[PDB]
């Protein structure tokens, strides 16, 4: 028997949660491969009120670029005049007899098992409990 | 028997949750492969009121680019004059005899099993409980 | 027998939930492959009132670009003069004898099983409980 | 026998839920492949009142682009002069002898089984319960 | 026998739900493939009153573009002068001897089974219960 | 029996959580390979109020670049005139007889198992408990 | 029996958590390989209020670069005129008969097991407890 | 029995946590290989209020570079005119008959096991406890 | 029995944590190989308020470089005119019949085990405890 009685108080004006605006979860995972890279800000834990962050506060830019006006026989396969961009330029240009991405192989992800769990995600106010 | 009695109080004016605006969940997962990369801000945990963030607060840009006016025989397969863009430029251009993406292979995802679970996602206020 | 009696109070003016505006769920998943990348903001957990975020607060841009006026024999297969865009430019241009995407393979997703579960998604106020 | 009696109070003025505007669900899933990427904001959990977010607060843009006026023999297969766009430009242009997308393969999704479940999605107020 | 008696109160003025404006559901799923990507805002959980969001608060744009006036032999297969658009430009242009989309393959979705379930979606107020 | 009685107080004016704006989770993982690199800020833990960070506070740039005007026979496979960009330029250009990425191999991810767990993610206020 | 009674006080005006804006988690992991390198700031722990950091406070740059105007037979495979960029330039250019990345090998990730766990992630205020 | 009674005080005005803006976690790991190098600032522990750091406070740069105007037969495979960049230039250029990265070998990551754990991540205020 | 009673005080006005903005963790690891080198600042422990650090306070640079204008037969495989860069230039250029990186070997990471742990990460204020 976890407890005979609670007997918390002889008087009380309230018990419980007012204005609960919180967001709760159990975002745990069980996998074989994760790719979360290629970002401009990442995994930064900032505790405290009135936090602030800026990628670029101010940029007074004037800009000229020329990838053209080329009178030559062959200009090909080229990324050029890229600028003022906040983010990732990935696999931008490819020139090939054959291009492939992520071929999944022969019998390459077979018979893999997961047995992962949690008991509860609970936010509560109780006079006595277990 | 978890408890003989609750006997919490001799007087009370309320018990429970007022104005509950919270969002609860159990977003746990069981998988073999996850790809969540290629972002401009990611996995940043900011505790505290009045938090603020800006990707680019101000940019007074003037800009000229030329990828044309080319009198040459062949200009081909090229990303050019990209600019002022916040995000990801992926697989932008391809020139090939054959192009493929994600071929799924021969017997490449067979007989894989998952047995994953949770008990509850519960936000509550109770006088006594188990 | 979980409990003989509740006997919470001798007097009470209310018990329960007023103005419950919350959104509850069990968004758990069991799968083999997830692709959630290529975003401009992602997985950012901001606790606290009066939070604010801006992708670009202000941009006073003047802009000139030319991908034309080309008197040459062949200008082809090219992404050009892209600008002021917040988001993802993916697989923008392809030039090939053959183009394919996501071929699903031979016997490539066969006999895979899932056995995943949860017990409850419950927001409640009760005097005594189990 | 979970409980002999509830005996919660000798007096009460109410028990239950007033003004319940909440949205409840069990959005759990069991699958083999999920693709939720290519977004401009994603998976951002913002707890707290008076939250605000802007993709672009202000943009005073002046803009000139030219992809034409080309007197050359062949200008072809090209994305050009894209601008001021918030979202995703995917598979925008293709030039090929053959174009295919998502061929589903030979015996490529056969005999796969799911056995996934939940017990309840319940928001309630009860004096005593199990 | 779950309980001998409820005996909740000696006096009561109400029991039940007034003004219930909530929306309840069991949106759980069991499938093999889901594609929910290509959005401009996604999976953002905002708890708290007076939340606000804007895609673009203000844009004072002036704009000139020219994809024409081309005196050349052949201008073809091209997306051009796209602008001020919030959303997705997908598979915009195709030029080919043959174009296909989603061919469903030979015996490619055969004998797949689902056995998924829930017990209840219930919002209730009861004096005692099980 | 964890406790005979709680007997916390003879008088009380409240017990519980007011204005809970916190975000709780169990983001633990069990995997074989993780790639979270290629960022511009990462894993920075900043405790304390009024924290601030800037990627570039101010940049008054004037800029000229030329990758064109080339009268030579063949200019090819080149990234050029990249500038003023905050983020990652990955696999930007490829020129090959064949290009492949992430081939998944023969029997290369087979029979791998996970058995990982947690008991609870719980934020609560209780007079006595276990 | 962990305790006979709590008997904390004869009078009290409150017990619990007000304005909890904290973010809690159990981000522990069990894996075989992690790659978190290639960043511009990393693993910096700054305790104390009013912390500040700048990547580049001010840069008054004037800039000229030329990778063109080349009248020679073959200019190829080259990254050039890169500048004013805060982040990572990885695998920028490749010229080859064959290009591959991350081939996954033969039987190269087979029968690997994880058995990792935690008991709780709990932030709470209780009069007496275990 | 860990304690007969708490008997903390005869009077009290509060017990618990106000304004908790802290971020707690258990980020422990169990693996075989970690690569966290190639950064511009790393593992710097700065205790104390009003901390500040700058990568480059001020740079008044004027700059001219030329990698072109080359009339020679073959200029190839070269990184040139890189400048004013804060971050990592990795694997920038490759010229080869074959290029490979991270081949995963034959039976090279097989039967490896992890059995790692923690008991709790708990921030709390309690009158008496164990 | 760890203690008969706490009997801390006859009067008290508060007990607990106000304004807790701290960030706690258990970042312990168990592995076989770690590579955290190649940085511009590292492992610097600075105790005390008002700490400051600068990579380069001021640089008034004027700069001219030429890697071009080469009329010779073959100029190849060369990093040139690199400048004003704060960070790491790694594996910048490669010219070879074959290039490989990190081949994982034959049976080279097999049967390795970890059994590492911690008991708690706890920040708390309690009248008496164990």
Residue numbers in the entry:
A (entry chain E), B (entry chain F), C (entry chain G), D (entry chain H), E (entry chain I), F (entry chain D), ...: 1 to 130
Show passages lifted from the paper.
Lysozyme is an important component of the innate immune system that helps to neutralize pathogenic microbes. Natively folded lysozyme possesses a compact, globular structure and has been the archetype example of a protein from the α + β class of protein folds. The protein contains two domains, an α-domain with mainly α-helical conformation and a β-domain containing mainly β-sheet structure.
We here present a 2.8 Å cryo-electron microscopy structure of an amyloid fibril, which was isolated from the abdominal fat tissue of a patient who expressed the D87G variant of human lysozyme. The atomic model, which we derived from the 3D map, depicts a polar fibril with C1 helical symmetry. The fibril consists of a single stack of fibril proteins; this is, the fibril contains a single protofilament. The fibril protein shows an all-β fold that lacks elements of α-helical conformation. The fibril encompasses fifteen cross β-sheets (β1-β15) with strands varying from two to nine amino acid residues. There are three internal cavities that are termed here A, B and C. The fibril protein fold is stabilized by four intramolecular disulfide bonds that occur at residues Cys6-Cys128, Cys30-Cys116, Cys65-Cys81 and Cys77-Cys95. The mutant residue (position 87) occurs within a tightly packed, hydrophobic β-arc of the fibril that is formed by residues Cys77-Cys95. The stark differences between the native protein and the fibril protein conformation demonstrate the need of unfolding of the native conformation for amyloid fibril formation.
